[PDB]
Amino acid sequence: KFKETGVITPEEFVAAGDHLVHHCPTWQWATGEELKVKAYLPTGKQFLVTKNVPCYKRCILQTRTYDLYITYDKYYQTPRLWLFGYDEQRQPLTVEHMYEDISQDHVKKTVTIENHPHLPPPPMCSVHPKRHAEVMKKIIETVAEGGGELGVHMYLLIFLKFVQAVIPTIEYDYTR
Amino acid sequence: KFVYKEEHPFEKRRSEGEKIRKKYPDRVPVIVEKAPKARIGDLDKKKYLVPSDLTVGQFYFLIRKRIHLRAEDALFFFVNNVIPPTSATMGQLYQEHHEEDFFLYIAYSDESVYG
């Protein structure tokens, strides 16, 4: 299990990230800007990146690609999803265009436009982790009631599985 | 969702706002209150009369100092559920979001989503 069911420590974040990168090689570790390196995480493992994730339709195809990031939020002790998109012509999407790929349930509730905590501007979209610990805690206890166990390594895999509801057309990898 | 909108009726607020805007045209009356479920320090003062040429980013710094925060601690403003840009002036933010009582209302918290 975890040190505190629902949240995640920096070491648990590395362990869960190392398993995500192994299971889904489209995700990789990164360091980011030098002046924004955190000391409680390995300099080589500051956050997870996956690039050129296809997005074929909104919420002939007009396909759009997305860079998605998973940073660690020491405030909530949970991961935090970040995403930035491009059109077919590799041009950066405006803010209002990225909201076409965010489901109507979360456009104004759980999505903000802030700077990536490890990268320079322009700002990016971010699913707010305000309620993440409460939901992951219910999931961990559910798989335990079901006779299984949600290990530390598969925390981000299950996290990515459920945040899909926020961006149901951005086809990032977390299985197979 | 502001305590000031309960302790003062709408007519008393509008009369003060109209008179304050008339007395001080280069200043705008602002009300600042903490989010109900925010875990940061409270403000000893909520009725502010700020200059129009003061930028929102500069008003961040004053409110930061009044609750004793550093540059690394989080602080966000919410005006009608919108985080204003720190480059806009308080006079521009007032012209766009001031209520019918001629007061600009701002809520602050340590979270990007006050809910």
Swiss-Prot record, chain A:
Show the domain comment. The N-terminal region works in concert with its geometry-selective amphipathic helix (AH) to promote LC3-PE conjugation activity only on the target membrane.
Role, per record = E2 conjugating enzyme that catalyzes the covalent conjugation of the C-terminal Gly of ATG8-like proteins (GABARAP, GABARAPL1, GABARAPL2 or MAP1LC3A) to the amino group of phosphatidylethanolamine (PE)-containing lipids in the membrane resulting in membrane-bound ATG8-like proteins which is one of the key steps in the development of autophagic isolation membranes during autophagosome formation. Cycles back and forth between binding to ATG7 for loading with the ATG8-like proteins and binding to E3 enzyme, composed of ATG12, ATG5 and ATG16L1 to promote ATG8-like proteins lipidation.
How is the subunit organization of this protein annotated in UniProt?
A: Homdimer. Interacts with ATG7; this interaction forms an E1-E2 complex that is essential for the transfer of GABARAP thioester from ATG7 to ATG3 and disrupts interaction with the E3 enzyme complex. Interacts with ATG12; this interaction is ATG7-dependent, essential for phosphatidylethanolamine (PE)-conjugated ATG8-like proteins formation and also mediates the autoconjugation of ATG12 on ATG3. Interacts with FNBP1L.
Q: How is it modified after translation?
A: Cleaved by CASP8 upon death ligand binding such as tumor necrosis factor-alpha. CASP8 cleavage blocks survival-related autophagy and favors apoptosis. Conjugated to ATG12 at Lys-109. ATG12-conjugation plays a role in regulation of mitochondrial homeostasis and cell death, while it is not involved in phosphatidylethanolamine-conjugation to ATG8-like proteins and autophagy.
Q: In which tissues is it expressed?
A: Widely expressed, with a highest expression in heart, skeletal muscle, kidney, liver and placenta.
Q: What EC number(s) has UniProt assigned to this enzyme? A: 2.3.2.-
A Gene Ontology BP annotation from the UniProt entry: mitochondrial fragmentation involved in apoptotic process
Looking up InterPro entries in the UniProt record yields:
Atg3/Atg10
Q: Disulfide pairs?
A: none
Q: Where in the cell is it found?
A: Cytoplasm
What organism is recorded for this protein? Homo sapiens
**Origin: domain of life:** Eukaryota
Q: Which family does it belong to?
A: Belongs to the ATG3 family.
Q: Which GO terms describe its cellular component?
A: Atg12-Atg5-Atg16 complex; cytoplasm; cytosol; phagophore assembly site
Its lineage reads:
Eukaryota, Metazoa, Chordata, Craniata, Vertebrata
MF (Gene Ontology): Atg12 transferase activity; Atg8-family conjugating enzyme activity; Atg8-family ligase activity; enzyme binding; ubiquitin-like protein transferase activity
Pfam families membership:
Autophagy_act_C
> Active-site positions, per UniProt?
K130 (glycyl thioester intermediate)
Q: Which UniProt keywords apply?
A: Acetylation, Autophagy, Cytoplasm, Isopeptide bond, Protein transport, Transferase, Transport, Ubl conjugation, Ubl conjugation pathway
The kind of enzyme this is, by top-level EC class, is transferase
Q: Does the keyword rRNA-binding apply?
A: no
For this chain, the site of the Glycyl lysine isopeptide (Lys-Gly) (interchain with G-Cter in ATG12) cross-link is: K109
Q: What is this protein called?
A: Ubiquitin-like-conjugating enzyme ATG3
Curated annotation (Swiss-Prot), chain B:
Task: Specify where the region named Interaction with GPHN lies, as residue ranges.
Answer: 35-115
For the site Interaction with LIR (LC3 nteracting Region) motif of ATG3, which positions are given? E16, R27
Question: What is known about its processing and modification?
Answer: The precursor molecule is cleaved by ATG4 (ATG4A, ATG4B, ATG4C or ATG4D) to expose the glycine at the C-terminus and form the cytosolic form, GABARAP-I. The processed form is then activated by APG7L/ATG7, transferred to ATG3 and conjugated to phosphatidylethanolamine (PE) phospholipid to form the membrane-bound form, GABARAP-II. During non-canonical autophagy, the processed form is conjugated to phosphatidylserine (PS) phospholipid. ATG4 proteins also mediate the delipidation of PE-conjugated forms.
* Protein name, UniProt field: Gamma-aminobutyric acid receptor-associated protein
Report keywords, A-Z.
Apoptosis, Autophagy, Cytoplasm, Cytoplasmic vesicle, Cytoskeleton, Golgi apparatus, Lipoprotein, Membrane, Microtubule, Protein transport, Transport
Family annotation (InterPro entries): Atg8-like (IPR004241), Ubiquitin-like_domsf (IPR029071)
Instruction: Please give the subunit comment from the record.
Output: Interacts with GPHN and NSF. Interacts with ATG7, ATG13. Interacts with ATG3. Interacts with alpha- and beta-tubulin. Interacts with GABRG2. Interacts with RB1CC1. Interacts with ULK1. Interacts with CALR. Interacts with DDX47. Interacts with TP53INP1 and TP53INP2. Interacts with TBC1D5 and TBC1D25. Directly interacts with SQSTM1. Interacts with MAPK15. Interacts with TECPR2. Interacts with PCM1. Interacts with TRIM5 and TRIM21. Interacts with MEFV. Interacts with KIF21B. Interacts with WDFY3; this interaction is required for WDFY3 recruitment to MAP1LC3B-positive p62/SQSTM1 bodies.
Q: What does this protein do?
A: Ubiquitin-like modifier that plays a role in intracellular transport of GABA(A) receptors and its interaction with the cytoskeleton. Involved in autophagy: while LC3s are involved in elongation of the phagophore membrane, the GABARAP/GATE-16 subfamily is essential for a later stage in autophagosome maturation. Through its interaction with the reticulophagy receptor TEX264, participates in the remodeling of subdomains of the endoplasmic reticulum into autophagosomes upon nutrient stress, which then fuse with lysosomes for endoplasmic reticulum turnover.
Region ranges (Interaction with LIR (LC3 nteracting Region) motif of ATG3): 47-49
Which PANTHER family did the record assign? MICROTUBULE-ASSOCIATED PROTEINS 1A/1B LIGHT CHAIN 3-RELATED (PTHR10969)
Q: In which tissues is it expressed?
A: Heart, brain, placenta, liver, skeletal muscle, kidney and pancreas.
Covalently lipidated residues, kind Phosphatidylserine amidated glycine: G115
Chain positions covered by the region annotation Interaction with beta-tubulin: 1-21
Could you tell me the superkingdom of the organism this chain comes from?
Eukaryota
Give the residue ranges for region: Interaction with GABRG2. Answer: 35-67
Task: Family membership, please give it.
Answer: Belongs to the ATG8 family.
- Which GO cellular component term is one of those annotated? microtubule associated complex
Q: Which gene encodes it?
A: GABARAP
Indicate where this protein resides in the cell. Answer: Cytoplasmic vesicle, Autophagosome membrane; Endomembrane system; Cytoplasm, Cytoskeleton; Golgi apparatus membrane
Q: Where is the lipid attached (Phosphatidylethanolamine amidated glycine)?
A: G115
